[PDB]
Design a protein around this ligand. Structure first.
Ligand SMILES: *[C@@H]1O[C@H](CO)[C@@H](O[C@@H]2O[C@H](CO)[C@@H](O[C@@H]3O[C@H](CO[C@H]4O[C@H](CO)[C@@H](O)[C@H](O)[C@@H]4O)[C@@H](O)[C@H](O[C@H]4O[C@H](CO)[C@@H](O)[C@H](O)[C@@H]4O)[C@@H]3O)[C@H](O)[C@H]2NC(C)=O)[C@H](O)[C@H]1NC(C)=O
Ligand SMILES: *[C@@H]1O[C@H](CO)[C@@H](O[C@@H]2O[C@H](CO)[C@@H](O)[C@H](O)[C@H]2NC(C)=O)[C@H](O)[C@H]1NC(C)=O
Ligand SMILES: N=C(N)c1ccc(N2CCN(C3CCN(CC(=O)O)CC3)CC2)cc1
Ligand SMILES: *[C@@H]1O[C@H](CO)[C@@H](O)[C@H](O)[C@H]1NC(C)=O
Ligand SMILES: [Ca+2]
Ligand SMILES: [Ca+2]
Ligand SMILES: [Ca+2]
Ligand SMILES: [Ca+2]
Ligand SMILES: [Mn+2]
Ligand SMILES: [Mn+2]
Ligand SMILES: [Mn+2]
Lengths: 454, 466, 214, 216
């Protein structure tokens, strides 16, 4: 409703860097808000794409940002009569970024890994990896829970059970308020998908450079399965956290599996031991139900509600014809120990191929009426196909069915405006939560400041 | 007695005709002051109205093109008639309706294009062996249905990129099956092999030289290949006037839009041709898999009948996709494609067993209604489609157009075309709302309030500005 | 296999000293080395891993260094608890191999041993055996040589030696040598002597007795 | 907290077999590699092998191929080391080891399990008094404990009374049997003025003999 679409702020990265692929707000130890930006195709030392991360100080004028530096060199360790290898070429550092406390977590889902032993090998595969930074102190750490030293022959013998070679850990990411990092790895267990969790504190204290293979004892990984319903489900394509079991001491995980059960798609709510509490099934095959998930209490009863994006949902229209427009599903959490019922509200895109619901960002309470609100992206929506972000306001019965405000892309065609979103943080300290929108196609980020309601 | 024509008390000839389709206007001078000029045509002549001064348009419908339906689709440079009539002139006065018919025939001996698009991942090795004579075998059976058959071949595996592709050791790139005791081709996304041709032994010999490759994950990149086989018109060689059968064979799941992100591919599919002189899909490693919606758009655009010929372990999957892509056919393929011949023949029959009318560019103010006559002269009201047809059969539809009021533009045209068909019925509509006498109006007539009005159709009208 | 040559075998040092133990591999192991500690009569504790990284709980006065095939363990300001055995281990290649070990001992002023010889007891002789015992108590350094002589002539067969660890009180060492003969053979001779050779004297410390006579 | 708790000391005969255990405490045994190391006074430390309890795959030093057999049961959270066709040279202390962080390191150690291979039967010691020969200001007595098996033995003077100025030397293996000695030093005015006794206990054969030192 009250985001200012006239005076925007623009941050920009190098051409072709995909600056703005991912982003988040970052508060330093003094509470000063900055913007961390991932640029997964930033050039490295060898003039080769490796990705990169930028930490943008808040300025109304915006502009260029300094780099948040990470080691981009390939590593090699000869130990235990084996040879460990990391490969950072085209690893996509900054394909996801998230901030917790005064720490930044930036991931490279497509970092490859291999282990050589004489003539055999583990196979060169994208286990993925995450880089952690404490900007103020300069502390650095890494986390790559899918790295292993098992040779190829062994996997073949055991029918590829517990095969974490293609995890792509960090594909998606989130951090609990308690400081537990949770990574989505959609390629885990031969593309079933898995989650990897570990306290940030333990990642730092257990990490040392040059080791490449080390234990994080406090970590917890999800489980493999023989059920074909999970095969190629990309469990962990998206991830989020919230409170859904009525126990405030426990933190529940929300996991998106957009190709679950032969591309039907699904979203699951689990406890911290990866035990399934609920499962939301997709409505339409190939709609990619679970591409994005969002957790926020929209109707002000103190109970977290669930939003799920299916950006490729085909709406039914006249003459038995279908139109790909995308759809968002709202699930209100019921009072006490009960299952999430049918959706409370269905929001459906309008523009053909607009991909409405590709991203869903909690905005907090934008208009300050006591109800939290959201922003939904249609990165190729709008009458021009340049992209749109639609704001929906909370209310006692859930969300409004019509948007209170629509943000048209200020960038050219192909910018993918709205592919990444983040809200619920007051960056200019005016008492209103603001919205940052990534447009990696244009290598830029737009900041929308919330203003007093008119 | 009085009627809606007189009791409405109209002011002009145009307003008179707008009352009801039965109303007529008398532009005669010698007409009593008390007698209305807007009445039934019978009542006007009854009141000694000059027949020439009577304005009374009648909604009609006359054919302009009415070629006879062809008995054979063979021969000719596509002078084949599938729809009749091909063009009609439609005239409608306000709030009136006229009716017309249309005949549609599934013409016998119509040319056919069959492009064989084949999964050549490792499990399809034995499938290649069994179709080595498919070209000639398929030629023999299709000869019973058509005298103009063309066939072609294309193959796919998956996007040649990690993690779908094995990328270590270096040997694995030249030979993905190195760690086994055989050789297979380097991985390829989609490659066109044989342009549609009537020389069927070209199919046999090309197939005999084909071989499989090997990739990591069960879902394959067949939808990339369907898109390219559809939009690369000139390369695949689809003919303008022919049935287009795209035979998609596979024994596995398939990749769909937004899967590509696991290979670091986020660029949406642009639905354009990207097969060059090397006959390989060059955007395989840089462009995402196509969506069902985009696939549907292009299949429809190019009149391609997609056939999902898949194994029993995935028939349910592709049957469900088929429901999301109207016009698509599914058949059960054996584990070695040994039955693919009969599968194609049955599919071709099923494809030509339906006639479904479609309307293009219908004006807002026009509404249509349909009565189908399928089988033996059995009318079916409120239906614009027929099923269970055989080659050579003919069906007909009774159509009625109802116009609401009168539109600004007095001449428009729309189309009635069966789905997948070449021919169509063009309906040229004309909205007869005006009167002929208006073309000879007298502006600033000295009969109308000292030049303050216009005299038309035998009455005075307030001029412009008043 | 990779040979791990650890040096020195032992060193005499005091509290607060800054000492350094070294380890040489037969080939490059690229920091794939660990350092271990074993306090007297107890199990092992990890000090260093991957050449320089301190194990959790280890004091910062410990530190590892080196590269290629030469590495070092350093202890700044020795504590009373640091006097123990230290081993290096490489895990660059299977099988894992260990260093010979290094024992840190308490340094002190030299001290000559207190020698004491003891003829066979009456009980043992009546049973058919005969053991002459020779105690060498409280001396420093640890290096000492005992020599048995029967009728002046050296005897090497049937000798049994035993040493104690560095004493907790005076930080000295002690040794027990026992010459066992048969009853019959013990009586073939008269003079029984044990000679102690220590760096605290050029002349060997001699103690002896004569059978029958007393 | 990470603790490796091994089984008690074993006492077996040659040609037989034994199976040591290593139970994880405060963590899952399945987390890391578990190694086994052999220690002897002369030969020093030797690496036997490792096991990954998550799958049961093992590696061995070719020296121990045949005798050593490492296994693991994730249920009881325990790792095992089986030794077969035992020999005198298998007499050693065996430790189970795991890494802290580094996958290949050797950081946490069990307390160690003592193994002793011998054909010796349970034999009681022979305690002999050691009085000096027929002068100075300081006198030194002794006590010889000979030919006992197995270890250990507790030696005290005057029943723990006289403790200071004593040197009980480590036992030594003399032909399948153990031999031990102990000396004590006091002033000349103490002995033979005051009675000095050598108390030796051998709980194995359950014998507590005591010999009073008498002059010559
Ligand atoms: C291709 O597309 C088809 C059509 O959608 C899919 O088939 C459906 O699959 C779903 C999921 O397995 C089925 O769901 C269940 O319906 C049951 C009741 O169904 C009856 O009515 C149909 C009508 O034709 C009968 O044919 C059928 O025999 C039944 O008698 C419920 O009992 C089920 O409930 C339980 O499971 C669900 C989770 O699935 C829980 O949430 C519930 O609480 C409960 O425990 C379930 O709702 C559906 O029936 C199927 N329809 C048909 C017509 O078969 C294929 O799966 C799909 N295949 C692929 C590969 O995509
Ligand atoms: C489709 O068929 C219906 C009959 O079911 C036609 O409607 C009838 O038309 C006659 C005119 O002769 C009327 O007398 C009937 O009252 C109508 N019945 C209805 C409307 O239920 C209709 O005209 C046909 N449409 C076309 C386009 O042929
Ligand atoms: N339950 C689990 N985690 C699990 C689930 C599934 C698997 N996979 C087993 C291997 N499958 C291959 C076989 C060879 N083909 C070659 C080709 O088509 O070119 C590609 C597909 C894929 C599925 C493994 C493990
Ligand atoms: C219009 O409808 C009438 C009534 O059924 C019918 O007689 C006439 O043939 C129809 N017109 C055409 C062109 O078929
Ligand atoms: Ca909870
Ligand atoms: Ca709520
Ligand atoms: Ca609000
Ligand atoms: Ca603000
Ligand atoms: Mn396959
Ligand atoms: Mn096959
Ligand atoms: Mn595949």
């Amino acid at each position: 409703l009250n985001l200012d679409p006239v005076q925007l702020t623009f941050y920009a990265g190098p051409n072709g860097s995909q600056f703005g692929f991912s982003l988040d707000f970052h508060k330093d130890s003094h509470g000063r808000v900055a913007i961390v930006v991932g640029a997964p195709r930033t050039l490295g030392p060898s003039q080769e794409e490796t990705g990169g991360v930028f930490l943008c100080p808040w300025r109304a004028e915006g502009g260029q940002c300094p780099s948040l530096l990470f080691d981009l060199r390939d590593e090699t360790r000869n130990v235990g009569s084996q040879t460990l290898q990391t490969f950072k070429a085209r690893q996509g550092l900054g394909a996801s970024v998230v901030s917790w406390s005064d720490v930044i977590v930036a991931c490279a889902p497509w970092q490859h890994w291999n282990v050589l032993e004489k003539t055999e090998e583990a196979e060169k595969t994208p286990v993925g990896s995450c880089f952690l930074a404490q900007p103020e102190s300069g502390r650095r750490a890494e986390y790559s829970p899918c790295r292993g030293n098992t040779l190829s022959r062994i996997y073949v013998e055991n029918d590829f059970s517990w095969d974490k070679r293609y995890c792509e850990a960090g594909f998606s990411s989130v951090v609990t308020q308690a400081g537990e990092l949770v990574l989505g790895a959609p390629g885990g267990y031969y593309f079933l998908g898995l989650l990897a969790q570990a306290p940030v504190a333990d990642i730092f204290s257990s990490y040392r450079p040059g080791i490449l293979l080390w234990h994080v004892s406090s970590q917890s990984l999800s489980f493999d399965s023989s059920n074909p319903e999970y095969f190629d489900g990309y469990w962990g394509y998206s991830v989020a956290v919230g409170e859904f079991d009525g126990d405030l001491n426990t933190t529940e995980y929300v996991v998106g599996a957009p190709t679950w059960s032969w591309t039907l798609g699904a979203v699951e709510i689990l406890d911290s031991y990866y035990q399934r509490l609920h499962r939301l099934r997709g409505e339409q095959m190939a709609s990619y139900f679970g591409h994005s998930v969002a957790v926020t209490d929209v109707n002000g009863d103190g109970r977290h509600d669930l939003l799920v994006g299916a950006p490729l949902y085909m709406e039914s229209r006249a003459d038995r014809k279908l139109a790909e427009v995308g759809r968002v599903y709202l699930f209100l959490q019921p009072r006490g120990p009960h299952a999430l019922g049918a959706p409370s509200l269905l929001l459906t895109g309008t523009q053909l191929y607009g991909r409405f619901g590709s991203a869903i960002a909690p905005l907090g309470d934008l208009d300050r009426d006591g109800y939290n609100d959201i922003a939904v992206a249609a990165p190729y929506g709008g009458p021009s196909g340049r992209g749109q972000v639609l704001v929906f306001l909370g209310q006692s019965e859930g969300l409004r069915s019509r948007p209170s405000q629509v943000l048209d892309s200020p960038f050219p065609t192909g910018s993918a405006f709205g592919f990444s979103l983040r809200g619920a943080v007051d960056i200019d300290d005016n008492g209103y939560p603001d919205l940052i929108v990534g447009a990696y196609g244009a290598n830029q980020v737009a900041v929308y400041r919330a203003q007093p309601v008119v | 007695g009085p009627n809606i024509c007189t009791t409405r008390g109209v002011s002009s000839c145009q307003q008179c005709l707008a009352v009801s389709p039965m109303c007529a206007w008398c532009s005669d001078e010698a007409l009593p002051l008390g007698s209305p000029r807007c009445d039934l045509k019978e009542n006007l002549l009854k009141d000694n109205c000059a027949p020439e001064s009577i304005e009374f348009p009648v909604s009609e419908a006359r054919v302009l093109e009415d070629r006879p339906l062809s008995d054979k689709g063979s021969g000719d440079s596509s002078q084949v008639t599938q729809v009749s009539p091909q063009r009609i002139a439609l005239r409608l006065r306000p709030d009136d309706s006229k009716n017309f018919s249309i005949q549609v025939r599934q013409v016998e001996d119509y040319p056919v294009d069959i492009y064989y698009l084949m999964d050549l991942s490792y499990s399809m090795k034995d499938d290649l062996w069994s179709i080595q004579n498919l070209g000639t075998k398929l030629a023999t059976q299709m000869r019973k249905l058509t005298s103009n058959l063309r066939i072609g071949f294309g193959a796919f595996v998956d996007k040649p990129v990690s993690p779908y592709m094995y990328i270590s050791p270096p040997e694995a790139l030249e030979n993905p099956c190195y760690d086994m005791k055989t050789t297979c081709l380097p991985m390829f996304g989609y490659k066109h092999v044989l342009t549609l041709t009537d020389q069927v032994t070209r199919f046999n010999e090309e197939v005999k030289k084909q071989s499989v490759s090997r990739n990591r994950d069960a879902p394959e990149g067949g939808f990339d290949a369907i898109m390219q086989a559809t939009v690369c018109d000139e390369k695949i060689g689809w003919r303008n006037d022919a049935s287009h059968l795209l035979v998609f064979t596979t024994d596995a799941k398939t990749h769909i839009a937004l899967d590509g992100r696991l290979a670091g591919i986020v660029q949406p599919n642009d639905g354009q041709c990207h097969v060059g002189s090397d006959n390989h899909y060059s955007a395989s490693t840089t462009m995402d898999y196509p969506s069902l919606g985009l696939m549907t758009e292009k299949l429809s655009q190019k009149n391609i009948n997609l056939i999902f010929a898949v194994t029993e372990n995935v028939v349910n999957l592709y049957q469900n996709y088929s429901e999301l892509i109207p016009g698509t056919t599914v058949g059960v393929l054996s584990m070695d494609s040994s039955n693919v011949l009969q599968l194609i023949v049955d599919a071709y029959g099923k494809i030509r067993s339906k006639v479904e009318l479609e309307v293009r560019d219908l004006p807002e103010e026009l509404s249509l209604s349909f009565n189908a006559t399928c089988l033996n002269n059995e009318v079916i009201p409120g239906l614009k489609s027929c099923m269970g047809l055989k080659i050579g059969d003919t069906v007909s539809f009774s159509i009625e157009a109802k116009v609401r009021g009168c539109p600004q533009e007095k001449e428009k045209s729309f189309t009635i075309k069966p789905v997948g068909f070449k021919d169509s019925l063009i309906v040229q509509v004309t909205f007869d709302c005006d009167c002929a006498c208006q073309a000879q109006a007298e502006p600033n007539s000295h009969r109308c309030n000292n030049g303050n009005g216009t005299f038309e159709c035998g009455v005075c009208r307030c001029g412009p500005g008043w | 296999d990779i040979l791990m040559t650890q040096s020195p075998s032992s060193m005499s040092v005091s509290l607060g000293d800054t000492v350094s133990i070294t380890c040489h591999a037969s080939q490059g192991i690229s920091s794939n080395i660990g350092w271990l500690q074993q306090k007297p009569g107890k199990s092992f504790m990890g000090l260093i891993y991957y050449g320089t990284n301190l194990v959790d709980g280890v004091p910062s006065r410990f530190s590892g260094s080196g590269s290629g095939a030469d590495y070092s363990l350093t202890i700044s300001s020795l504590d009373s608890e640091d006097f123990a055995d230290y081993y290096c281990v490489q895990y660059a290649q299977l099988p894992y191999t260990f260093g010979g070990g290094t024992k840190l001992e308490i340094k002190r002023a030299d001290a000559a041993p207190t020698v004491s010889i003891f003829p066979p007891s009456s009980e043992q002789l009546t049973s058919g055996g005969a053991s002459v015992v020779c105690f060498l108590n409280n001396f420093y350094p640890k290096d000492i040589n005992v020599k048995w002589k029967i009728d002046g002539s050296e005897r090497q067969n049937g000798v049994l030696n035993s040493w104690t660890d560095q004493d907790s009180k005076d930080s000295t060492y002690s040794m027990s040598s026992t010459l066992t003969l048969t009853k019959d053979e013990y009586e073939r001779h008269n003079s029984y002597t044990c000679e102690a050779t220590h760096k605290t004297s050029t002349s060997p410390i001699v103690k002896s007795f004569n059978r029958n006579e007393c | 907290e990470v603790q490796l708790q091994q089984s008690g000391a074993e006492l077996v005969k040659p040609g037989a077999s034994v199976k040591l255990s290593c139970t994880a405490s405060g963590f899952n045994i399945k987390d890391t590699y578990v190694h086994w190391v052999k220690q002897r006074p002369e030969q020093g430390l030797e690496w036997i092998g490792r096991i990954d309890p998550a799958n049961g795959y093992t590696k061995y030093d070719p020296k121990f191929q045949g005798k050593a057999t490492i296994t693991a049961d994730t249920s009881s959270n325990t790792a095992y080391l089986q030794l077969s066709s035992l020999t005198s040279e298998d007499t050693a202390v065996y430790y189970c080891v795991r890494p802290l962080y580094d996958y290949y390191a050797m950081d946490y150690w069990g307390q160690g399990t003592s193994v002793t291979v011998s054909s010796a039967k349970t034999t009681a010691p022979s305690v002999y008094p050691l009085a000096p020969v027929c002068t100075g200001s300081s006198v030194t007595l002794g006590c010889l404990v000979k030919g006992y098996f197995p270890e250990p033995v507790t030696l005290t003077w005057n029943s723990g009374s006289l403790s200071s100025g004593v040197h009980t030397f480590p036992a030594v293996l003399q032909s399948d049997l153990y031999t031990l000695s102990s000396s004590v030093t006091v002033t000349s005015s103490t002995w033979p003025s005051q009675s000095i006794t050598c108390n030796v206990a051998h709980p194995a054969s359950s014998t507590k003999v005591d010999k009073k030192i008498e002059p010559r």
